[PDB]
Amino acid sequence: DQIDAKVIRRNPELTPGIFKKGIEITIDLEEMVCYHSGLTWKVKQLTNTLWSLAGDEHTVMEVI
């Protein structure tokens, strides 16, 4: 119900230091969020291995 994902693309408009390329993020599959920078971000599934922030599609995470 939880998966570890790697940030592979990040929106350049994001604050420097948030969703750095290469870090491991944990995604809660039931509620479809990821925990990062003390916040709960909404994520959506693009493919079985690729995920993006629900609103910011240009920040993409890859299942590890």
Please give the residue range of the domain that contains residue 36: 2-63
Question: Of 30, 23, 17, 28, which Cα lies nearest the Cα of 61?
Answer: 23
Tokens 């420097």 correspond to what residue? 16
Resolution rounded to one decimal, in angstroms? 2.3
Q: What is the Cα–Cα distance from 27 to 2, expressed in whole angstroms?
A: 6
| DSSP for residue 21 | T
Query: How many other C-beta atoms lie within 10 A of the C-beta of residue 54?
Result: 14
By what technique were these coordinates determined? X-ray
Instruction: State the total domains in the chain.
Output: 1
